[PDB]
């Protein structure tokens, strides 16, 4: 069973499908309207046929259903009907920051600062629940028509969670196992501070339209990160960005997780504490997107 | 694809003498080579055979006296027969379940021989990951052979599979990339397992054997976990207690390598030889 609170009914009983927004490996996403309230929702539809593995989708729903924070996409339930699973969420009309910057070009420093503050608020909430997003990037940060910021796409977090559960199920007898082996099997070998690093990379992505080393073979990038002299990336254009932005990048991209600041600590950084960070900055961006 | 597979009937080459066990992976036989008379172990198998493929490749690429020797594989009638050196006494667990606890000198010899095998494996960039009495075999001359690389193969396969579906890495933190490529721990896990095995041979159970395994996993993953110890202090020399202390070093950054452990007083002392285990096998028989 995918989730103990699934609605075993046709989602079309409750929603009018308005537009297919896209589709691929993850399934398809629809814009729909609540037939009673008139509110808009996103429906993510995935095939869910007998003997398919439900574990990843199960974990994704578990994450969404237990979050109640403005900066995490709101969850309105899931439907299982005729071997399709529909996950219903708050609609973000502008899509992701990647959808936006592919049209607008690079964001301003103030726009990036607001985005980073909103993402850090969502991360601090997730971390206080002992959750880890594990896939912070422009493609997974959604923007609504009011310029508000929502973390979404917990698929990677759910995949990791489901694999972690499978590791525990088949760990075998533990009595000869070294503690660090048990720790990797139970906890994964890293912690929530990985999300802070990913946010620093995301800030570079919003500034430059690509993450660092985007043109290097992925396996080479992984290898370089494991060398003892690996150097965190930096913003390319020194004079374009303030010292505060360069320092935000420096501290979020702290190599050692033992020394990397938490989401709550980062919320005190000058870049995201400064006045004038509000959704109007992103309304400006969305106007550019249409103008 | 193993390029050396013999595409012919193994029974045209070996006389099957005794089924030793198996299931549901397959069956294990004691067999005799038809031309030489040497005994061998034949493991018959058969799905996704890929992890078994990786397991055979481990055995095939190892060439060390303390690793059970590999002779070849026969493919016949959708059954793969893996031919290995025969160890007539079985595992140390098979033995101690009859004889009772080993002497300190017997344990010292076993530990030296396992450390030699581990030093070889680690230099080959392999991790055994399942060192325990059940996986250490004893031949009829009292010599020690590491065996059962099934866990090593399974963990390597699973590390490779995760790597294949890791997705794009450009937003990943370095510690996440390191877990993806290197698995989150290293070969020093085998040194810890050897320390537990030494307690097992001394006491007939690993520490915490009567604690629920999920509780053991809970305790071991907390920052305050204390490494176990031998329970009957006066029975064992200071050198044995110290060997346990250092092999069971909690921090993998401080735990000694197999080569370093081979210089420890317990395993470098004189009088450690296969005659000690021949005595054990005599006790097993008599
Ligand atoms: C991650 C996804 C399952 N998800 N989760 C919650 C959520 C809330 N709102 C949206 N909103 C949007 C808006 C737009 C706008 C159309 C025109 N430009 C962007 N596109 C898209 N997607 C095009 C590619 C897709 F995967 F189909 C989605 N989603 C998507 C949402
Ligand atoms: C790990 C195994 C596949 N393997 N690999 C190489 C190898 C070389 N020699 C043996 N020798 C023995 C001796 C004995 C002795 C019979 C009387 N007591 C132990 N039993 C067993 N088996 C009991 C349960 C099994 F898996 F079938 C094996 N194997 C086993 C070997």
What are the residue boundaries of the structural domains of chain A, listed by start?
1-91, 92-291
Catalytic residue among A13, A39, A99, A135: A135
Q: Which of B130, B140, B148, B279 is catalytic?
A: B130
B229 C-beta neighbours (distance < 10 Å), count: 12
CB B81 within 8 A of CB B119: no
Q: Select from A209, A202, A212 the least CA-distant residue to A105.
A: A209
Contact between chains at A257 and B179 (C-beta distance less than 8 A): no
State the SS3 of A127-172: HHCCCCCCCCCHHHEEECCCCCEEECCCHHHHHHHHHHHHHHHCCC
A229–B contact, CB cutoff 8 A? no
CA atoms of A246 and A233, how far apart (whole Å) = 11
d(CA B132, CA B129): 9
Q: Which of B256, B247, B258, B264 is nearest to B119 (CA)?
A: B258
- Cβ(B90) to ligand 2 under 6 A? yes
Q: Tell me if A207 CB under 6 Å of ligand 1.
A: no
Question: Helix, strand, coil: what percent of chain A each, to 5?
Answer: 45, 15, 40
With CA atoms as reference, report the closest residue to A88 among A64, A53, A112: A64
Contact A142, A150 (CB under 8 A): yes
Provide the token pair at A75. 């969850």
Q: By three-state DSSP, how is residue B221 classified?
A: coil
**From the CA of A74, which ligand is nearest?**
1
Q: For residue B9, what are the contacts with CB-CB under 8 A and spacing of at least 6? A: B74, B76
Task: Give SS3 for B121.
Answer: helix
Q: How many CB atoms lie within 10 A of CB A81?
A: 17
- Residue B131 distance to chain A (closest CA, Å): 7
Closest CA relative to residue A286, chosen from A18, A112, A115, A101: A101
A 121-140 residues with CB < 8 A to B: 134-137
Residue A66: name the closest of A6, A131, A123, A151 by CA. Answer: A131
Question: E strand or H helix at B261, and its extent?
Answer: helix B258-261
Query: Coil, strand or helix: which one is B279?
Result: helix
For tokens 């992103």, the residue is A282
Position of tokens 């008139």? A38
Residues of chain B found within 8 Å of residue A214, distances taken between Cβ atoms: 170
| Nearest alpha-carbon partner for B83 in B36, B152, B151, B141 | B36
At B10, list the tokens.
């193994």
| Contacts B196 to A, Cβ<8 Å | 175-176
Sequence-separated (6 or more) residues with CB below 8 Å from residue A60: A87, A154, A155, A157, A158
Distance CA A99, CA A94 (A): 8
The helix/strand/coil state of A73 is coil
d(CA B37, CA B31): 9
Alpha-carbon gap, residue B209 to B215, rounded angstroms: 11
Structure tokens at B260: 């370093």
DSSP line for A92-112: -TTEEHHHHHHHH-SPPHHHH
Which of A73, A80, A13, A16 shows the shortest CA–CA distance to A45?
A: A80
Ligand-binding site membership of A40 (annotated):
no
The answer to whether the CB of A2 falls within 8 A of the CB of A59 is no
Is residue A221 within 8 A of residue B169, CB to CB? The reply is: yes
What are A201's two structure tokens?
A: 């990379």
CB B138 within 8 Å of CB B89: yes
Rounded CA-CA distance A23/A25 in Å is 7
Cβ of B143 below 6 Å from ligand 2: no
The sign of the CA dihedral B35, B39, B45, B49 is: negative
CA atoms of B281 and B12, how far apart (whole Å): 33
C-alpha to C-alpha distance for A276 and B123, rounded to whole angstroms: 59
- Report how far residue A136's alpha carbon sits from residue A154's, in angstroms, rounded to the nearest whole number: 10
Q: For residue B277, report the distance from its CA to the centre of ligand 2, in Å.
A: 17
- DSSP, res B174: H
DSSP H stretches of helix in A155-279 = 155-169, 179-187, 194-208, 218-225, 243-252, 263-266, 270-273
A264 annotated ligand-binding residue: no
Q: Is the peptide bond before B24 cis (omega within 30 degrees of 0)?
A: yes
Paired with A16 in beta bridges are: A33
CA end-to-end span of chain A, whole Å? 47
Structure tokens at B1: 């694809």
Query: If DSSP codes are grouped into helix, strand and coil, which group holds residue A208?
Result: helix
* Alpha carbons B156 and B182: distance in angstroms, whole number: 10
**Smallest CA–CA separation between B5 and chain A, in Å?**
31
Q: Does A176 touch chain B (CB under 8 A)?
A: yes
Partners of residue B170 in chain A, C-beta under 8 Å: 201, 211-214, 218, 221
Measured distance CA(B134)–CA(A176) in Å, rounded: 11
Backbone angles phi, psi at A48, to 5 degrees: -145, 80
Q: In angstroms, what CA-CA distances link B95 with A192, B88, B146, B203? A: 47, 11, 15, 13
Query: In this structure, are residues A201 and A253 in contact, taking their beta carbons and an 8 Å threshold?
Result: yes
Q: Within 10 Å of residue B18's Cβ, how many Cβ atoms?
A: 8
Residue with tokens 């309304």: A283
CA of B90 to the centre of ligand 2 (A): 5
Residue carrying the six token digits 């550019």:
A288
HEC string for A11-74: HHHCEEEEEEEEEECCEEEEEEEECCCCCEEEEEEEECCCCCCCHHHHHHHHHHHCCCCCCECC
Q: A138 a known binding residue?
A: no
How many residues appear in chain B?
286
Q: Are B257 and B122 in contact (CB under 8 A)?
A: yes
Pairing of the two strands A141-143 and A95-96: antiparallel
Which residue is it, tokens 């005994």? Answer: B39
Apex CA B97: angle with CA B92 and CA B99, to 5°?
85
Confirm whether residue B26 is marked as ligand binding: yes
Q: Resolution of the experimental model in angstroms, please?
A: 1.5
Return d(Cα B188, Cα B95) in angstroms, integer.
27
Closest CA to B46 of B78, B82, B23, B20: B78
The Cα–Cα gap between B124 and A116 comes to 46
User: Could you give the CA distance from residue A26 to residue A47 in angstroms, rounded to a whole number?
Assistant: 9
Q: Which of B154, B141, B156, B155 is nearest to B65 (CA)?
A: B141
CA distance B157 to B51: 6
Angle between helices A280-290 and A109-128 (to 10 degrees): 120
CA of A95 from ligand 1 middle (Å) equals: 5
Distance CA A114, CA A274 (A): 9
Q: Which two tokens stand for residue A140?
A: 């997974």
Distance CA B137, CA B142 (A): 9
Strands A15-24, B79-85: pairing kind? unpaired
Centre a 10 Å sphere on the Cβ of residue A34 and count the other Cβ atoms it contains: 14
Tokens of B235: 């029975």
Cα–Cα separations (whole angstroms), residue A75 to A97, B87, B211: 20, 61, 41
Rounded distance, CA A133 to CA B252, Å?
Answer: 28
Q: Answer yes or no: do B129 and A179 touch at CB < 8 A.
A: no
Q: Is B255 exposed, middle or buried (0-12, 13-18, 19+ CB in 10 A)?
A: buried
User: Which residue in A1, A40, A42, A9 sits closest to A23, CA to CA?
Assistant: A42
CA B188 – CA B190 distance, rounded (Å): 5
Please check whether residue B43 is in contact with residue B86, taking contact to mean a CB–CB distance below 8 angstroms. Answer: no
- Name the token pair of B136: 């250490």
What is the four-CA torsion angle of B63, B67, B72, B76, rounded to 10 degrees? -160
To the nearest 10 degrees (0 to 180), the angle between helices A243-252 and A194-208 is 140
CA gyration radius for chain A? 20
Report the DSSP beta bridge partners of residue A50: none
B196, A175 in Cβ contact below 8 A? yes
Q: How far apart are CA B1 and CA B53, in angstroms?
A: 8
Phi and psi at residue A103, to the nearest 5°: -100, -45
CB neighbours of residue A160 within 10 Å: 18
B12 is catalytic: no
d(CA B26, CA A273): 64
- CA-angle at B150, arms to B200 and B187, nearest 5°: 65
Q: Which two tokens stand for residue B75?
A: 């493919």
Q: Is B94 in the pocket of ligand 2 (CB under 6 A)?
A: yes
Residue with tokens 């601090």: A124
Number of Cβ within 10 Å of residue A6's Cβ equals: 19
Query: Using CA atoms, how far apart are residues B156 and B152, in angstroms rounded to an integer?
Result: 6
Please choose, from the candidates A191, A237, A233, the residue with its C-alpha nearest in 3D space to the C-alpha of residue A213. Answer: A233
List the single residue in A with minimal CA-CA distance to B209: A175
């Amino acid at each position: 069973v995918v989730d103990p609170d699934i609605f075993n009914r046709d989602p079309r009983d409750h929603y009018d499908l308005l537009q297919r927004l896209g589709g691929g490996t993850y399934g398809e996403v629809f814009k729909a309207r609540d037939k009673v309230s008139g509110d808009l929702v996103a429906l993510k539809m995935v095939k869910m046929e007998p003997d398919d593995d439900v574990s990843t989708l199960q974990k994704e729903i578990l994450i969404l259903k237990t979050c109640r924070h403005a900066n995490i996409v709101a969850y309105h339930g899931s439907y299982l009907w005729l071997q399709k699973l529909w996950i219903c969420m708050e609609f973000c009309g502008a899509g992701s920051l990647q959808d936006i910057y592919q049209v607008t070009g690079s964001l301003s420093e103030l726009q990036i600062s607001y985005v980073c503050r909103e993402v850090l608020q969502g991360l601090a909430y997730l971390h206080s629940q002992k959750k880890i997003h594990r896939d912070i990037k422009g493609a997974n940060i959604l923007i609504n028509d009011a310029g508000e910021v929502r973390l979404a796409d917990f698929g990677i977090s759910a995949q990791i969670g489901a694999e972690l559960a499978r590791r525990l199920e088949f760990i075998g007898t533990p009595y000869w196992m070294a503690p660090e082996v048990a720790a990797v099997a139970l906890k994964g070998g890293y912690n929530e501070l990985c999300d802070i690093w990913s946010l620093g990379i995301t800030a570079i992505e919003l500034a430059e339209l690509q993450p660092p080393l985007f043109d290097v073979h992925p396996l080479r990038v992984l290898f370089l990160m494991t060398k003892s002299g690996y150097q965190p990336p930096r913003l390319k254009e020194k004079g374009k960005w303030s010292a505060a932005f360069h320092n935000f990048i420096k501290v979020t991209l702290t190599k050692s997780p033992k020394k990397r600041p938490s989401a709550t600590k980062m919320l005190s950084h000058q870049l995201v504490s400064q006045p004038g960070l509000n959704r109007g900055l992103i309304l400006d961006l969305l106007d550019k997107l249409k103008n």
